[PDB]
Design an enzyme around this catalytic site. Sequence first.
Site, mmCIF file in Angstrom:
data_model
loop_
_atom_site.group_PDB
_atom_site.id
_atom_site.type_symbol
_atom_site.label_atom_id
_atom_site.label_comp_id
_atom_site.label_asym_id
_atom_site.label_seq_id
_atom_site.Cartn_x
_atom_site.Cartn_y
_atom_site.Cartn_z
ATOM 1 N N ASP A 345 1.015 -1.047 -0.099
ATOM 2 C CA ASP A 345 0.162 0.267 0.307
ATOM 3 C C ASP A 345 0.522 1.425 -0.112
ATOM 4 O O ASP A 345 0.142 2.176 0.026
ATOM 5 C CB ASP A 345 -0.832 -0.023 1.309
ATOM 6 C CG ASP A 345 -2.153 -1.022 1.387
ATOM 7 O OD1 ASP A 345 -2.097 -1.758 0.646
ATOM 8 O OD2 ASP A 345 -2.717 -1.256 1.844
ATOM 9 N N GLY A 346 1.989 1.045 -0.356
ATOM 10 C CA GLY A 346 3.248 2.524 -0.454
ATOM 11 C C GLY A 346 4.576 1.911 -0.624
ATOM 12 O O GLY A 346 4.770 1.262 -1.122
ATOM 13 N N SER A 370 2.218 6.940 0.903
ATOM 14 C CA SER A 370 1.408 6.226 1.857
ATOM 15 C C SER A 370 -0.336 6.266 1.284
ATOM 16 O O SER A 370 -0.973 7.265 1.350
ATOM 17 C CB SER A 370 1.836 6.626 3.060
ATOM 18 O OG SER A 370 1.037 5.603 3.523
ATOM 19 N N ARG A 371 -0.359 5.040 0.671
ATOM 20 C CA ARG A 371 -2.026 4.912 0.342
ATOM 21 C C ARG A 371 -2.713 5.611 1.718
ATOM 22 O O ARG A 371 -3.931 6.464 1.662
ATOM 23 C CB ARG A 371 -1.766 3.811 -0.915
ATOM 24 C CG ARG A 371 -1.253 4.229 -1.832
ATOM 25 C CD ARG A 371 -2.249 3.065 -2.879
ATOM 26 N NE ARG A 371 -1.523 2.436 -4.197
ATOM 27 C CZ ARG A 371 -0.133 1.950 -4.376
ATOM 28 N NH1 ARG A 371 0.495 1.563 -3.015
ATOM 29 N NH2 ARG A 371 0.509 2.511 -5.561
ATOM 30 N N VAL A 372 -2.514 4.320 1.987
ATOM 31 C CA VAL A 372 -3.774 4.462 2.660
ATOM 32 C C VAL A 372 -3.060 4.745 4.196
ATOM 33 O O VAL A 372 -2.588 4.146 5.269
ATOM 34 C CB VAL A 372 -4.489 3.272 3.646
ATOM 35 C CG1 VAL A 372 -5.910 3.199 3.124
ATOM 36 C CG2 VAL A 372 -3.364 2.026 3.133
#
Lengths: 499, 465, 466, 45, 54
Positions: A345-346, A370-372
């Site tokens: 996720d990143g 960093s997506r979430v």
Amino acid sequence: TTTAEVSSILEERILGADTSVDLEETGRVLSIGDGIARVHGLRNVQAEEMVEFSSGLKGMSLNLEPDNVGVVVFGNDKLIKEGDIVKRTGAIVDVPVGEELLGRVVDALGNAIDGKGPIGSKTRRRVGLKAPGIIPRISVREPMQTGIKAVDSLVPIGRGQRELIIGDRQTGKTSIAIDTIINQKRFNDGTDEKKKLYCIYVAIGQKRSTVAQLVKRLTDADAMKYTIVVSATASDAAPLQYLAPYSGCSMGEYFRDNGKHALIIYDDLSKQAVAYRQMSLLLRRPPGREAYPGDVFYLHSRLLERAAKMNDAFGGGSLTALPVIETQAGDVSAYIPTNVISITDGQIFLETELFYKGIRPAINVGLSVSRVGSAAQTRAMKQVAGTMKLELAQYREVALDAATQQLLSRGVRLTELLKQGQYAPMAIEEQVAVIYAGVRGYLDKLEPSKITKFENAFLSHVISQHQALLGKIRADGKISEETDAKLKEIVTNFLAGFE
Amino acid sequence: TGRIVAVIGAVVDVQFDEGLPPILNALEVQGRETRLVLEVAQHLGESTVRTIAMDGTEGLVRGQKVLDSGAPIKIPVGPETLGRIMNVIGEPIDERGPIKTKQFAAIHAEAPEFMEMSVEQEILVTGIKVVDLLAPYAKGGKIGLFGGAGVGKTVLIMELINNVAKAHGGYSVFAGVGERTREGNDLYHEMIESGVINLKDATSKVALVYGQMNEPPGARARVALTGLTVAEYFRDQEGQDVLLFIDNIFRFTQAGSEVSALLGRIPSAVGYQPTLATDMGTMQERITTTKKGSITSVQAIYVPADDLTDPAPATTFAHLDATTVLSRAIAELGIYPAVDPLDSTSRIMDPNIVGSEHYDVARGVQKILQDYKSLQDIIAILGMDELSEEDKLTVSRARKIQRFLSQPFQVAEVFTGHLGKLVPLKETIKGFQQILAGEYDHLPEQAFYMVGPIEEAVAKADKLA
Amino acid sequence: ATGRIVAVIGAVVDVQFDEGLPPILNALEVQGRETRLVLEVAQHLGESTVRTIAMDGTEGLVRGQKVLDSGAPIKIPVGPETLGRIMNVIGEPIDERGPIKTKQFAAIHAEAPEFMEMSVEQEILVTGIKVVDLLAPYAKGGKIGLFGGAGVGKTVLIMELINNVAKAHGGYSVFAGVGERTREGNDLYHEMIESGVINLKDATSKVALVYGQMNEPPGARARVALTGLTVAEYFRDQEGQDVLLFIDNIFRFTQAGSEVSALLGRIPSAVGYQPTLATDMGTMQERITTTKKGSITSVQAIYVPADDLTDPAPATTFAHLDATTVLSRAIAELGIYPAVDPLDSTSRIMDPNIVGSEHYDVARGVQKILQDYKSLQDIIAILGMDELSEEDKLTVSRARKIQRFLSQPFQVAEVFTGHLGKLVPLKETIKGFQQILAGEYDHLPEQAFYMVGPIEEAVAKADKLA
Amino acid sequence: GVRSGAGAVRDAGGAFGKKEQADEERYFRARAREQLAALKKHHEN
Amino acid sequence: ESTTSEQSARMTAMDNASKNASEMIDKLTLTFNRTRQAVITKELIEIISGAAAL
Ligand SMILES: Nc1ncnc2c1ncn2[C@@H]1O[C@H](COP(=O)(O)OP(=O)(O)OP(=O)(O)O)[C@@H](O)[C@H]1O
Ligand SMILES: Nc1ncnc2c1ncn2[C@@H]1O[C@H](COP(=O)(O)OP(=O)(O)O)[C@@H](O)[C@H]1O
Ligand SMILES: [Mg+2]
């Protein structure tokens, strides 16, 4: 011919002496070599079931051929000979799990290698459990403070997220993970019981001396008491390196499924991929890009997908994964790096150019995302980090007019601010105050080479006398207007005093 | 006792009746004038083991009896192996009689366990100013010695052996993997002249393990392990800080690839063996610091196609803890040793390992050298009067530093007539710190050329005018 | 007819039947397992022995274990009751809301629509994205592909397309998550619950979800796309509706086929792929078509391994797409989001007769000036900008402004960059690009066109940095 | 080690090769025009 | 004055062009190494597959 069409088996059949030997539960090695042992018998063996050899090594029944069983040996194949007796254990390959492994340096199979005695585990968990589905998961909410200013500010890592630490050799990939391990000590010592993070470190293919020195660093920082070190070094056989990530993943899944929060560091997943490529090629499977097997993406996906954040229905636990991928000459567009990027996720790029120039950590803030991460960031850190990120982006865009000169100066000040020492993670409120100082234009006057000294003095000043303000920030989670005014006053006073 | 059933190339298959030998076991072929040792690599089934040969396979007949030795290839080891040349199988090849020792050790041994590993990085002081200052050698680490001929690599090897023997009282082992026979003889006689190996008394400091290029790939694949076992004896049974040399690691990787290819195993990327990482790890992990002693490996490196991203150099760099590069330009500048002060790097060059003072001094030296490079570019383009007084003083200090990096060698005393110096680390750090502080800016440039401690530099300055 | 398991190698299980060999593409239930392990017959190996591909993990399988033939291919619940529900490969509801009570079931494997059933109607699906609408417009009922490497914007772009079209789409929608992040599936499920496209209370849901993710074994990932396609086929044919079929990612189907073909015993094709790389892909893709009964406007995300468009899996799929959108990592490095390559994305409706003369002229002019700039890039890179002619400098400036103006903020990306998403209409972006090509905005700075929507926003941003 | 040779700019056939070819052609067209004019003037004699 | 300025600017521009060319050279060298390794691996894989399918 076939593997079991050998003359010895045929003689056993024709002579009629196929009654004394227990072919249902035991077996004899037909051919050991290339790391895969063919076993005749084990008619009641299961797929992926762990079988133990006469010498003591344990193996996983990978291929169940009609006449034989292909067993991969978790160890040196020298100790296995033709005619050795292989017996079932009656269990899919699993690993000891629980809090009894906290502080224990174990190998891929869970055996203690620190000489502190046997593991007092009471439950064993399969190393190949399926990742949780859509329903059991919930969005990443709680923050996972790493202690690094650059990480906790520009690339926030959530609790349950999968953040890749990607870079070249000697770029600080391991140092970030170690600092993250140490940073959790403040939460683990306290009685929060919801901010505790039980770390796990998995060494895949790296030097034994490096792992021992890492364990020494963790012990000296009193961080071993809440971390598990799974070691599968270079000397260890390829199956051990292949299995090591899954063992640590199961150890973290134990915490995840019991309402606790855990962190797993898959150090050098690229070395695990190399080991699996070796295993597949010795099995004579068709290689693909870079001679890799066609299922390396599945190899990493079925591993990283297990790291997730569970909802309150399933205990509310979590498992954060920070895999490490080694890239050659900074080749992000390569098979294994692109596979892992498609899973995580990143990413946190650690450019060797920045590391050489002295920018430690070497995070490439332009390309690190960093997506979430935004949801799992404290309000005060978010308030300072949004402005910091905007200013840094504008600095990168322009790097003689007064405005662009000010922009470049502010960018240089922020870049020097992001520089941090090793083995000294910072508290969240301390980072908030430090970033507040730079963002609000209290460092534009100082010479760039004096910024690090200013921070070293300012941390000491604030942490000593102005502890109340930091405590208020930590309790509130945000920088209030009164907090803003007090922090502004104290930073101005210290700036005047610093001279 | 088995019988040969297949002599395909260098791969020999032996079928046993009573007891199948385990993998990595030494099989001795009967009926041959010279010893032919077969190493078991696979168990093919039907009581047949596939073995690779350590010598030529001509004259082998299907049905020749082969005796299982009962253990891996065991070499003669001990203090009496110093000053001798032995091949992979341990036979002496220096024509000086049998190597009479007390015990033998199998080349294939497990890496030291996790507890036996040391947990503290420590600098191995080699007595060389440039190495001990800018690219220190970690005790129990691996060093990548770049550069080939014309830069005095062999002289550096001999001086490292002599310095480690004199300072730490530890012996050295030179394992030449795929070494040319002519170059092997030249190195042997050069070491004899240097005195690091003596043919009269037992004061030799080097145990030579030569695997020549004309030997089969299996021999060159295990010559490194033979030398490593010789070093392991000194590390374990004597507790010495051994110094292992591999010339070079790339030929070890190539021999491993050839051995894997002969066994019909599908190659990995850029035509390397699938077990490249695992074989390299099994070789390197035995080079570590145990509680009894340590083994430090200075491995020469050849980068194929000048591509640092090739699998062999990348896997080798995965284990390196420092690099020393011998630049021909530095040798042409007249500075011996020709270690490049900028391109040479050490992983332990960290304040937490070598101390704040050492790190600061080394970083200042490197910064001054880089500034000197920039100012030399400016002088090449513009005139020397363009640069300011500060630039001129930095140029002078950097020239003094880069001439102070030069050092006379004891191994070269007989040739150049200049006495060799074993500069301690403290003296090196103090001298370079004083040079950076501008204390000796009045001394001439040649006052620091080919000297030991800075006191000898001031003495030489007094000698001049 | 019941058989016995003989071989268990990976996800490929070989079963020997005493009598009644099940035909190819027939589901077989493995007896004695707590879960439901169902095997899909792939080959008849002879000696009354079949070779199967498992739809779940094969752990714990014992040689000789009894497996019962279902007598039919894998069938899934299909119908209006599947809307607002999450399904796996074999049509088991994984949303823990109970069984999917549908009145009929449909086989996973079906034949593609015949030649006569095909439809040739072509319209334009305005998606509100400047790059897509201008250069490579989408056609209603036409296959659409979103090529790209790792982390270039495929998922974000497909989510933006969903937010733009599906919410405003009158008909039903089907999402088939093949080999993607499971947390992405959870986020999509919760977003559709919040937006009301999926309702957990009454039967007003509009979108049906099928999820086989990267955690699934290769057997599952090679058939989940077929499950979503079957649901879309039912909605298209038996109800005569207009349906959107979003697939992400469709490359994992080919990757799963490659993973299973090594065990199936096939000589590998180029780059270790399966020899049946184009046949199975064509069989899967030609079912995703607009027949005369209904229209399937499909948007498919295609992963590009190692950013290599010449890889067989992303290369053979070009022929199956009407409108192609090729993202590029180099553009994303410059911050131009979306990372659509204007000189690599193509559409079939990009024709003056269909899209209009003005639209075609503007698009061709933009492509021409971009190609001229790219040709000039080498001289600019080596010598410098000062060596060009005045007309060359003007072309470079206009092309850089066009590159900046192609970038557009997305509503789904608001939580990322903090810039409000913009949904430009077709006429507004046509006018903006025509004005930029004409030269009306040759005095504004390049940054005035970055991350803005309509050209009015560009001119209202230029004067901010006066 | 990878090296290069003489006349490798036109071999790549990139922007610089076409630029060099065009520059040579434009120069030698003028030179041919001048030589033709001089030759015609000489032939008139 | 013009000739002095022109020579200085010519030197500066040529230096900048040389720096840009060197940067492009190293990038293309990395790409060339990747391509060479890929070609070797691909050809060896083809040979191995042909031998195994025999
Ligand atoms: N924040 C930092 N400040 C200063 N030095 C640092 C920092 N982080 C790492 N280093 C230095 O980097 C070196 C090794 O870094 P590290 O092992 O973390 O990198 P890596 O790329 O993960 O390594 P490898 O590939 O060898 O495992 C050491 O010399 C250490 O002192
Ligand atoms: N339109 C956009 N605007 C800003 N950032 C974007 C955009 N599209 C993609 N990104 C970046 O890409 C990342 C997500 O990429 P993703 O769509 O997951 O690609 P893939 O599906 O190929 O992995 C996000 O972190 C985001 O920063
Ligand atoms: Mg995606």
